[PDB]
């Protein structure tokens, strides 16, 4: 969004804590200072964290923000990030989400880096992170996860950092890395899996860690970690081989 003439911080941004950013980033005297758009467009990275911040409501003004660390907040709503474009690290971690609106992420292009980890998301929509074609690093460790959708990840080509600790996974669709061959760590520690599929890991050529820890497999298939050529870490403990 735009404003047309110079508006109160307090009145963009509601929320006093987000207000109080905003303030300290561009240097105003009091969150009731009004600010203009040229003053918003300034704006390319916001550092927040652990401020208590219960909505970013406001947001939507700051065409030109590429990052965003907002980890340790009170967010449940991010509806407000939809259309900043430019991002491209957004840190989320540590909040109250506990779902995200099926297209979210849909114009976020330039995202490289995506952290949802601590929060208490239980599902991932269908195609979430289809357009997601710049992300490297997703972490979505400690959650309340039991599923993944088949193809939730299939357009994540340059996937390198794949966290899915954490969370109650009790199975694996099998393609569900089939796509990520320059993903280089995949942690799949403290789940519940029982088993895992034949071939999930056969196209992870270029996986160096694999972290399947803390899980309660009790056996492995064959042959199931044979193309990982450039495997370095491979942690199995805590399981029921
Ligand atoms: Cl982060």
Known sequence: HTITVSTPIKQIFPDDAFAETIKANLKKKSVTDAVTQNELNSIDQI???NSDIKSVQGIQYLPNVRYLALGGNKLHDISALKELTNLGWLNL???Q????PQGVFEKLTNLTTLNLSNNQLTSLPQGVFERLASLTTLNLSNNQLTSLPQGVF???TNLTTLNLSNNQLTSLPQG???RLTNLTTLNLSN???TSLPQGVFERLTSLTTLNLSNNQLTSLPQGVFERLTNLKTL???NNQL
């Open 47 to 49: 550092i927040a964290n």
């Open 93 to 95: 971690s540590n909040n």
């Open 97 to 100: 989400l506990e779902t995200l």
């Open 154 to 156: 299939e357009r994540l």
């Open 176 to 178: 569900v890395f089939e």
């Open 191 to 193: 789940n519940q899996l």
């Open 235 to 237: 942690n199995l403990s």
